[PDB]
Design a protein around this ligand. Structure first.
Ligand code: ZN
Lengths: 17, 29, 220
């Protein structure tokens, strides 16, 4: 049920500051 | 109704891919 | 048109060079045939308004970002090239989405590709922005053009990115160094590679593409 994204991987990108 | 077609000039996705491909190869050499 | 028949045959030849189980990379020994094929299509009057086959965009993305490697991968951060690459990546995603809408679960695969796509795209745009900010003087015209076309139109992000282009070079460089460390290119290399492989698998399994994924689909 996970093949390419690994369980608990964070693919959200910090905004710039 | 395309001006570059009527002018016989290269354009479109295949031409853009060609030029970009050349930029990459030149840079890597 | 016989020129169209010749062009389609050139496309079929490129397929046998471009389509890989893993990621394409140009071999010095294939350079002359590949280049001659690309140039022929690039000046072929009958291909000017033909659709680019998806295997060609995928090969471009693999070549442009050097996805065959896992080290500095000699990416050419040039505004015009990277803007074209993002448009190409978007065509791929557009086509993947249509495939899903007509051994593997569709809802899981679509969600994985979407998450990888969005991460990969944001990484490419951010590193293009970093390159702009690391030059002195800044090319503000192309920087702005690039942010409108591809910078996620958030209020306080483009707010800040345009303030930062007006900081002085030493401060821009300190800030760019910190954000590059917070988010190294190796992460986006991995996400983008996995996006391409995910897309290749879905297209083969669910539609009538062959991306030489047979040995991967079998292990499911
Ligand atoms: Zn035209």
């Amino acid at each position: 049920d996970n093949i390419f994204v690994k369980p608990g991987e964070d693919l959200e990108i910090p905004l710039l500051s | 109704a395309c001006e570059m077609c009527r002018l016989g000039l290269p354009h479109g996705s295949f031409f853009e891919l060609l030029r970009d491909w050349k930029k990459i190869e030149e840079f890597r050499n | 048109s016989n020129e169209k028949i010749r062009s389609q045959s050139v496309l079929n030849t490129l397929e046998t060079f471009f389509i890989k189980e893993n990621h394409y990379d140009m071999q010095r020994e294939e350079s002359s045939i590949v280049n001659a094929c690309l140039r022929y299509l690039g000046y072929s009057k009958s291909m000017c308004h033909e659709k680019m086959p998806i295997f060609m965009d995928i090969a471009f993305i693999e070549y442009c970002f050097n996805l065959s490697l896992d080290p500095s991968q000699q990416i050419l951060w040039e505004y015009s090239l990277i803007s074209n690459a993002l448009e190409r990546l978007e065509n791929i995603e557009l086509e993947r989405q249509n495939c899903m809408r007509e051994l593997l679960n569709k809802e899981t695969l679509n969600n994985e590709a979407l998450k990888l796509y969005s991460c990969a795209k944001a990484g490419i745009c951010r590193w293009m922005a970093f390159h702009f900010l690391e030059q002195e003087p800044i090319d503000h015209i192309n920087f702005t053009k690039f942010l409108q076309d591809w910078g996620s139109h958030n209020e306080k992000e483009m707010e800040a990115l345009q303030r930062l282009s007006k900081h002085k070079i030493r401060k821009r460089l300190i800030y760019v160094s910190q954000h590059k460390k917070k988010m190294p290119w190796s992460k986006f290399n991995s996400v983008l590679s996995r996006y391409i492989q995910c897309t290749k698998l879905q297209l083969e399994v669910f539609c009538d593409y062959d991306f030489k994924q047979r040995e991967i689909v079998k292990m499911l």
